[PDB]
Amino acid sequence: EEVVVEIRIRVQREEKVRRLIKRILEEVKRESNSVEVHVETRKRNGEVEVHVRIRHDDKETIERLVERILREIKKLDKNSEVEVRTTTKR
């Protein structure tokens, strides 16, 4: 069964969105080329939300990639608000 992870990142200022998306896509590239990733930016009332959806068959790969993404998010902005939603079939 496939694992789907959705990561929502609340960014303070829109100027930091480009580096954040670039860093996240770089970590996905370093993991494997079989990992499916989609990125979506949402702007409401001067605030930006970055939505990352990742699909993969191996839960070990998914959990390793998520933790590495969360560490890279924290290095770019210590006060980043992140919500992670993981969907699995059993």
Q: Answer for the pair 47, 54: CB distance below 8 angstroms, yes or no.
A: no
Q: Where are the alpha helices (DSSP H) in 2-79?
A: 17-31, 59-76
d(CA 44, CA 54): 23
* Given resolution (angstroms): 1.8
CB 11 within 8 A of CB 46: no
Q: From which experimental method does this structure derive? A: X-ray
